[PDB]
Structure 1
Amino acid sequence: NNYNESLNKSKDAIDDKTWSKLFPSIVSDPDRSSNFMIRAIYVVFSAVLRQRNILEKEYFSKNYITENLSCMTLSFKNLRAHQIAQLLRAAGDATKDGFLKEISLVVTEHDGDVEAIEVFSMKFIYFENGGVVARLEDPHFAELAQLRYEGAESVRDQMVTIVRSVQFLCTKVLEPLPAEFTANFRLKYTNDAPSNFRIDGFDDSSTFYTLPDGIQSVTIGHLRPGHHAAHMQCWSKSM
């Protein structure tokens, strides 16, 4: 379509060597839209774990999203880091079935607390009919549900924004975490999810997480591939 740079027809896909190292170049179709969310969960939650100093830099490796922007992703050579990545992969695989409502990184002072001192949450929306109509409370939903899929390049922009905001939030905005804490991954199944379906690594629970009444809330950003949407949020005592 742009003949000032190419005689070939334009394709809704990302032409970048660095991007392809971590993410699918096409995200418009249902499977690759879902594959993108899986990679997004892995990348963003890796960034959060590292940037908040929840796990030391030994558990991570240096990656790039663009030539200008780098991040720390969990390393598959380290066994404990690998076990966490599998957690994240299992939760990500549940977006293919369409069963995952929210996955949150939950920080508490004592192990087992239902009330957190810091939460990084990623809430999902599933679309049908060409990825246009949302399937069906929360403040983000009304807006994000109406949000259109605007191409691969827009998704890359949204991903770059999220990682920059995370690195900026954790470094320049949030206070350091207390000397003692328990970090946890907790998720919420959708209503469509069968009772026999369980995400590997996650034991069932009658408790999610609760917040303080005066805890602050900041939005990191959103993602809108072809057939899915995600909303990233942070509640924190350290704000």
Structure 2
Amino acid sequence: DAIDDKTWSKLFPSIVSDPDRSSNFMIRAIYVVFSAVLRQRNILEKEYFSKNYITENLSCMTLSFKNLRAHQIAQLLRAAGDATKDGFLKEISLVVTEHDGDVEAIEVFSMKFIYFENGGVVARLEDPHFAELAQLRYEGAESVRDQMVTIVRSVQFLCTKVLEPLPAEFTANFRLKYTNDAPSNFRIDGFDDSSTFYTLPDGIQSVTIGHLRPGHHAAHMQCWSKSM
């Protein structure tokens, strides 16, 4: 049960069955997917990115570590990904608003997580997805690779051929929710505390981008947008 590919191993672990590498995969997943969204929605210019490949056929733009500002955002995502190891990250989302600091959003790319116990089988515990995704089993490393490919392809398709262009003026933001399991002394570096998250217009539309299911974790990628 392992992926064999020089291209895949450049960005992802070839094995995701064990807890550590299942978590490590989630970290790289957060990085790759949210880099692609930042670029394909033209939130950041192409200079902040570098060309990467998920497959010898599929390419994506990842945040560069040469550029200081892009490096900073990468560490921000890395810090949120590191929270998955302890199971302290409930959801991380890229949130776009008309003005800086607004609670109500116009576009949201949410990644919600589920942590499994006892061999990565049993989910630890409302959201429409949870019931379905909690019942989803680990089906091997190759299935995970297929899920990752699907998500990246759906992101690029959604952002370039489905969603309308973002308005001329906006503020893009990364916002996350902590797990109840997370203790009061734990804080994810780069994220200032807040009693407010983000909200949605009642008429806003939603689309399911995809899901991820490595060994001991699960992720549900979703998109809310007025541009839809």
Q: Tell whether the structures are fold-level matches, with TM greater than 0.5.
A: yes
Unaligned segments of structure 1, at least 5 residues = 1-11
SS at match of 2:34: helix
Distance in 2, matches of 1:228 and 1:150, equals 12
SS at match of 1:18: helix
Q: Larger Cα Rg: Structure 1 or Structure 2? A: 1
State the match for 1:25 in structure 2: 14
Unaligned segments of structure 2, at least 5 residues = none
Distance in 2, matches of 1:87 and 1:205, equals 17
Distance in 1, matches of 2:45 and 2:97, equals 18
Deviation at 1:197, TM superposition (A): 0.2
Deviation at 1:76, TM superposition (A): 0.2
Distance in 2, matches of 1:204 and 1:98, equals 18
State the match for 2:29 in structure 1: 40
Could you tell me the percent identity over the aligned residues? 100
Deviation string, structure 1 residues 4-42 (Cα, Å, up to 9, x no partner): xxxxxxxx0000000000000000000000000000000
Deviation string, structure 1 residues 182-222 (Cα, Å, up to 9, x no partner): 00000000000000100000011000000001000000000
Deviation at 1:110, TM superposition (A): 0.4
Distance in 2, matches of 1:130 and 1:119, equals 33
Aligned pairs (5 A) from 1:80-229 = 80-229=69-218
SS at match of 2:6: coil
TM-score (norm 2): 1.00
Q: Say how many residue pairs are matched.
A: 228
Deviation at 1:74, TM superposition (A): 0.2
Distance in 2, matches of 1:109 and 1:97, equals 34
Distance in 2, matches of 1:196 and 1:202, equals 14
Deviation at 1:73, TM superposition (A): 0.1
Deviation string, structure 1 residues 124-163 (Cα, Å, up to 9, x no partner): 0000000000000100000000001000000000000000
Distance in 1, matches of 2:25 and 2:68, equals 24
Deviation at 1:229, TM superposition (A): 0.1
TM-score (norm 1): 0.95
